[PDB]
Design a protein around this ligand. Structure first.
Ligand code: GTP
Ligand code: GTP
Ligand code: GDP
Ligand code: GDP
Ligand code: MG
Ligand code: MG
Lengths: 429, 432, 429, 432
């Protein structure tokens, strides 16, 4: 039970998700064909959460792939693990998003959203008891920002009691990968505060540093960045798929981590992360995995946690480990960094321990941080939004698609309402 | 399935397309016969047999340049109804291109566009290759961009203009044809990529070490620009960018849609060695003012939006390592309202080398499409070339005698004076 | 327990330390890989003081290697026992120190000191109960003098109760190996009197004589000089690593040898030292090891002890020996050389006896002398400093790096304050 | 990763670099094609293939010496954009090197320096090989050292000047070019290593037993000096010394930065035997006044700082056995403020022999870089050569007519008179 429908929007969400289903198939022993080839029966005990069993003992992913251009769909279906998907799920347009929120949320995306929701509703009826939906997309693109946040608004109306966690790639501080990404992110964060139960802010600048500084990859491709996200994506739901000594699910990580219904913007983290040479020069213990998470250089969002306070922290562990060694370290980071945690939430760490490690590792972790440190994430975008909007630059590509200037004023006011809330509970005593 | 047809107007448009469609057949393994011994679909429609034909409309009002295509090596490639000729050229006359000779076959060209657009299931937009100097490239294009904006409207219509050089001009009435074509195509084109001849004269001499470059050599470099722009449609890339995304990221205001193309690396075989050509090395090549392909000083202006279109063995981490240094540099300054001034596209395919070409086989490249304030000095020159000639009313009787009003010149000059102050309005900083 | 973090600064400290970890790995049976290959369990009983046990039963040194040029780091990692270190510890700059104290303590070293302290603090948290830190460097160099004394000032602020013993190669009397070594030593001795608990003054001139006169090495390389220092370095902490009949540690040798908190400048000594031919012509007895230490020609500092008085003397012994034969000889040198010891400290010899000898030897010793004989060590440098500073020669390479002439006047006054103190307690009755 | 680019100005600079870069390819096994069948990185940047190219800028205002490089054996080694030529030489005229001809391509040379410095991640400093006599080596270098001190400033800029001999001069206006280049490079260079032609004429005759030595033979010995200075970067040594350490140990005052190079052993194959060449034997060779490479009497002055750069099979104990004897000798006297007057560097690599070379394959060597008071007599000669010529105002119209003021000569002479009294101020002893 507790099945999850995975939705992939944008070029980015399709490239993350094609690496995500590479991890899930490896954890459950699934071949490129779709047939089970593992050894343990613990892989098939909760196989149904990410898989529909087809006839002939084949498992197909419960993934819905959405794009507005057919270029990304050809990359999936011709690449490895592309034949595993149902060809009914590949719902793609022809025009492309045009790197535009309005062409993804109003013009081309609304023509395709009924082609997706009829597949969303078809997958949701085959599920026995639906857990909730996860969406992988970006905020700087057009399909991941426009078509993606359109799907959330149309699903939360149809499924208001379910969880809607998004794995949203957030625009980076240093480089801009899109000239209109302050416009695309701000119009999406307007949609994410009203329709998602939790949201996982990922920066490309942060994953560049982790591949360079921590993993010592001088030349990391996108597929090396996607392997970092996909190990985090499976790490959030690993106690839902495998037995553990203290199980969590997507609702336990929602209840424990969201003290206020707007404040659900998380920064992820993963441990251990070692190079090829520097893996034999380090012991894999729970105090090592703890101290690797709670620093700044292991955040997959490009914002220093030391400029803020953690409201709530979820550290989901994997592998055969002892609970005292876990519970000592979660206390240990709260003592010595008591200024770095919020005061009026005592004992703000959620602990989940699975029994199954990732492939080829002895034990692992997954950090889910809900800090006030992402107020600098939205102070930067709302500054980059206001600098562009005060001259009304690039506005006629969105005004020309049925939108007014009022939509931008309300979305920028909603973000400055949100930054004021993270500023409030950082200074609240 | 993301089809894109291209129009080639004037002698400059066709001779660019002779290098472009030579290049596309090499990138897709297509023979000159249209044969090959599924990614071609954006520019090639396929027949019932194994013969692929291009989605191109070659139009000229004189038959000389087309009959070299009809008898050349690529005779068997092109559909013979697409190679559209007139009888007499527009002959460096905008009025003959727009009123006298242009109206005779404008219904023939639109009929051939519509037969291509019917067999396109995913038609994204148009690629109009023309020049500002010639009468056909100025007159007939401005007639054509009016008609395509009526029939299609929402399609993204990209122009690739040969902008006239300041000190190098091959015709006398180039300041007349350029102003009269820009007044017309302003409200009808969506993004027009300026290219200059004198700057590519400089690049073929300095960077390619050619003493004597031909128009054949210049059209090879402009073919590499268009092949890098349309690289994301024709090939699977790590970070793709479509034709609708260029007009979104580069056009802040509907008047200002004139970026300038810049390609790197431009090296020969003797300099194919002796440097490693990292993605940081070729990116600092583009923002260098000597390597741009429009004779303007980008240090004398501010970049409004840049578009770095990488391709080949390009690693996305070193991309961010390259671009973040450029925002620190003082010589590359942006506009106050634009903190986010980059669009990045990465493709996996390296740019191929045409045999007999003067570029070397590189592992990576970059087509910088930078919209800048520094092109206002280019229009300030061209208005000064217009205001000298029109004050004595020189050459006006060639244009009035073919269907134009004398007051229409003052209408185009007041609009260009309105266009020149738009860069001044954008280039200043914001109060408070 | 009682773990030691070893820090290596300068070209010199890296070349001494790479020989030092060659000795410690031989004493504990550690291969080039890092895996235990000894025979006795006494080697692993206190393995943790200089080693962190990694996964797969491998021991990595707790060594932090610091330099400002990458030339020395390539010599370590490509030489023998270079693959044993953690590659995280190699913290090196690119510029090089420039043979400059100010470029090591202010300009380039301050840019790199936060890269070291974050590794120092990382090693110090993995330690159960921290003993204290040892630093190996020089005083005539730029990294060993500037970057090295910068690390001591930044650690003693963070760890004020720990011991900070330095093994500092002091400039020689006869030759000068650096034109500005009176400037580099004097600006470091200003830092060593305020931030170290003890300091082991070693001269290169003295080790040249010991290799020539005593060991009969006509051609001693640096690696033969480093083997003399490394056997002394392991000899100070050998009762901390192995059982003994009268154990000492780095605190017992600190309390017994430092009567006044400035007067902590020691001269080391080692015994036995025999040639290849002259080793069968001598019996290894405790009276022989005693009389080999307490002369002048076995001091590793180039200053005659007969020109001063020993305040306190530590003679750490190794090997199965009898305590009466030890205690008779320590009395015996105090009777016949009663003018050579200080009067108002009765019985000024500290005795430590380990049970484990060095490799291939029956028994050994290690002399730690705190004499007034090193007042001639600082009378020489302060003379060479004042001769250069009175003409302000070579000053603009240090004034140009943010320093004034006041720093030189205070450091030269601090040294003449120190020489006056060794002159005071030599004549005090 | 400790990269170091080198600049070669004038005919003297390039012909030294023809021997230097021949020597470096032998030390690293590099073919003349840049191939080899990880320690090269301080002077060689590597391409994508196995072809290593040097970090050298060869600049001359006449194309004759460069076209021998472009057609020589090392044609394929050098990046052809680095071999920078003019059209007309500076022609023994400082004003043509600094104002007339030098300003034309100074922006071209700095553009090629910056393309090297961008691909250097650990750029330590510069190696400017020039001469004081020629117009290019005096004029263009003094133009270049101004520009590099602006653009870089904190980088250690080492010069290797061919100082003009007292009785041997090949040009007439060498006393003019030497004073005018020294007034300019004084506040811009950090350490300039003087080398003389007449002294190496003496060494090739006496020590190498060559009756008739060429400039080819002199440039082999100056190449061994620079290869011994940069031996610690390129190779792992027992006691290493970097370019920043030379300016620290040898420059007591920012005006006085003129040491003199001295290499030993300088022997042939017939004298490769018949002596064992210990490190004490070759060290007493250096302090002997006959073996120095500047025509000065070091017995007539005081050494301020010496820098013994050993290499090869050198044992550090016998180093101290060698140097401690020299402090006892009366003929080698130091200055009163300097009791510590030695910097020692030991490398493990022996100096290699170039085939066709006149030096013998030795196991060990020494490059003594001694800063002394005895070079004040060299500037006392050169001021006396300047004061004779300028009193009659000879040759001034060649310099005024190319952009210089006549008062600028008196400005350089008063500064050199201020420089001459600096050695007198340092060479005296201290009171009390
Ligand atoms: N870059 C480039 N420019 C060209 C080429 N051929 C012609 N031109 C430019 O085209 C401009 C004139 O336009 P043309 O194409 O020759 O004339 P047209 O467009 O046919 O109009 P007509 O005058 O009626 O013939 C000149 O300024 C040339 O610089 C070419 O092969 N490459
Ligand atoms: N040591 C050495 N000196 C050289 C060599 N070639 C020329 N010189 C010296 O260079 C001095 C003159 O400088 P040049 O390099 O010939 O002239 P320049 O620097 O090119 O300046 P121009 O006069 O404009 O040509 C003469 O005094 C020569 O002694 C050489 O191969 N080795
Ligand atoms: N982490 C990561 N980010 C990606 C990847 N591919 C694209 N992106 C990001 O996605 C954004 C582009 O959005 P995209 O979905 O391609 O545009 P759209 O097609 O118009 O929706 C850029 O900001 C990229 O940084 C990837 O493989 N990994
Ligand atoms: N005993 C000993 N001393 C050394 C060794 N190597 C260098 N030194 C001394 O270290 C000093 C040089 O300092 P160094 O660290 O190399 O300079 P830096 O790199 O600028 O800090 C000289 O006085 C040498 O005598 C060695 O192997 N053994
Ligand atoms: Mg024509
Ligand atoms: Mg010359």
């Amino acid at each position: 039970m507790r099945e999850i429908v995975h939705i992939q929007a944008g070029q980015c969400g399709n490239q993350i998700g094609a690496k995500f289903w590479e991890v899930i198939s490896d954890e459950h022993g699934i071949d490129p064909t779709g047939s089970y080839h593992g050894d343990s029966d613990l892989q098939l005990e909760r196989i149904n959460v990410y898989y529909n069993e087809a006839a002939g003992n084949k498992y197909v992913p419960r993934a819905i792939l959405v794009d507005l251009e057919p270029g990304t769909m050809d990359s999936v279906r011709s690449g490895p693990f592309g034949q595993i998907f149902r060809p009914d799920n590949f719902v793609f347009g022809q025009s492309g998003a045009g790197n535009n929120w309005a062409k993804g949320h109003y013009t081309e995306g609304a023509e395709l959203v009924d082609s997706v929701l009829d597949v969303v509703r078809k997958e949701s009826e085959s599920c026995d008891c639906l857990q909730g939906f996860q969406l992988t997309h970006s905020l700087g693109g057009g399909t991941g920002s426009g078509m993606g946040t359109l799907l959330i608004s149309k699903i939360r109306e149809e499924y208001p009691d379910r969880i809607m966690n998004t794995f949203s790639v957030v625009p980076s501080p240093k480089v801009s990968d899109t000239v209109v990404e302050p416009y695309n992110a701000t119009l999406s964060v307007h949609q994410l505060v009203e329709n998602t139960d939790e949201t996982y802010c990922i920066d490309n600048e942060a994953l560049y540093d982790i591949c360079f500084r921590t993993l010592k990859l001088t030349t990391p491709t996108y597929g090396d960045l996607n392997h970092l996200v996909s190990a985090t994506m499976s790490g959030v739901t690993t106690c839902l798929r495998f037995p553990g000594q203290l199980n969590a699910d997507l609702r336990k990580l929602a209840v424990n981590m969201v003290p206020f219904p707007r404040l659900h913007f998380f920064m992820p983290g993963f441990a251990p992360l070692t190079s090829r040479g520097s893996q034999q020069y380090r012991a894999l213990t729970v105090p090592e995995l703890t101290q690797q998470m709670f620093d700044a250089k292991n955040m997959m969002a490009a914002c220093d946690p030391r400029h803020g306070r953690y409201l709530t922290v979820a550290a989901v562990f994997r592998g055969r480990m002892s609970m005292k060694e876990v519970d000592e370290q979660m206390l240990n980071v709260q003592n010595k960094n008591s200024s770095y945690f919020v005061e009026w939430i005592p004992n703000n760490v959620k602990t989940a321990v699975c029994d199954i490690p990732p492939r080829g590792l002895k034990m692992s972790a997954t950090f889910i941080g809900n800090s006030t440190a992402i107020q600098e994430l939205f102070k930067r975008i709302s500054e980059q939004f206001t600098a562009m909007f005060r001259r009304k630059a690039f506005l006629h590509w969105y005004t020309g698609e049925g939108m007014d200037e009022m939509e931008f004023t309300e979305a920028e006011s909603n973000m400055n309402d949100l930054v004021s809330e993270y500023q409030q509970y950082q200074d609240a005593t | 399935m993301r089809e894109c047809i291209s129009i080639h107007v004037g002698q400059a448009g066709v001779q660019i397309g002779n290098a472009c469609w030579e290049l596309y057949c090499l990138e897709h393994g297509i023979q000159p016969d249209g044969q090959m011994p599924d990614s071609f679909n954006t520019f090639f429609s396929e027949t019932g047999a194994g013969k692929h034909v291009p989605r191109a409309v070659f139009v000229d009002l004189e038959p000389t340049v087309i009959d070299e295509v009809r008898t050349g090596t690529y005779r068997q490639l092109f559909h013979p109804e697409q190679l559209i000729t007139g009888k007499e050229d527009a002959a460096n006359n905008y009025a003959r291109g727009h009123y006298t000779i242009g109206k005779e076959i404008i219904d023939l060209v639109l009929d051939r566009i519509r037969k291509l657009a019917d067999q396109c299931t995913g038609l994204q937009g148009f690629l109009v290759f023309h020049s500002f100097g010639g009468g056909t490239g100025s007159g007939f294009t401005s007639l054509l961009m009016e008609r395509l904006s009526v029939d299609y409207g929402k399609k993204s219509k990209l122009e690739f203009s040969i902008y006239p050089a300041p000190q190098v001009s091959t015709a006398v009435v180039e300041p007349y044809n350029s102003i009269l074509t820009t007044h017309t195509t302003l409200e009808h084109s969506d993004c027009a990529f300026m290219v200059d001849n004198e700057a590519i004269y400089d690049i073929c001499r300095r960077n390619l070490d050619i003493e004597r470059p031909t128009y054949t050599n210049l059209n090879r470099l402009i073919s590499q620009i268009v092949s890098s722009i349309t690289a994301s449609l024709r090939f699977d890339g790590a970070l793709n960018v479509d034709l609708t995304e260029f007009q979104t990221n580069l056009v802040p205001y509907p008047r200002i849609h004139f970026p300038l193309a810049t390609y790197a690396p431009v090296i020969s075989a003797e300099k194919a060695y002796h440097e490693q050509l990292s993605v940081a090395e070729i990116t600092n090549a583009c923002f260098e003012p000597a390597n741009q392909m429009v004779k303007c000083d980008p240090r004398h202006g501010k970049y409004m939006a840049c578009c770095l279109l990488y391709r080949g063995d390009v690693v996305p981490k070193d991309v961010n390592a390259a671009i973040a240094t450029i925002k620190t540099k003082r010589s590359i300054q942006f506009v106050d309202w634009c903190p986010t001034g980059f669009k990045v596209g990465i493709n996996y395919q390296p740019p191929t080398v045409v045999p007999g070409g003067d570029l070397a086989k590189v592992q990576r490249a970059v087509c910088m499409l930078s919209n800048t304030t520094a092109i206002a000095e280019a229009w300030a020159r061209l208005d000064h070339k217009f205001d000298l000639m029109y004050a004595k009313r020189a050459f006006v009787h060639w244009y009035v005698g073919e269907g134009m009003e004398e007051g229409e010149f003052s209408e185009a000059r007041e609009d260009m004076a309105a266009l020149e102050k738009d860069y001044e309005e954008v280039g200043v900083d914001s109060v408070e």
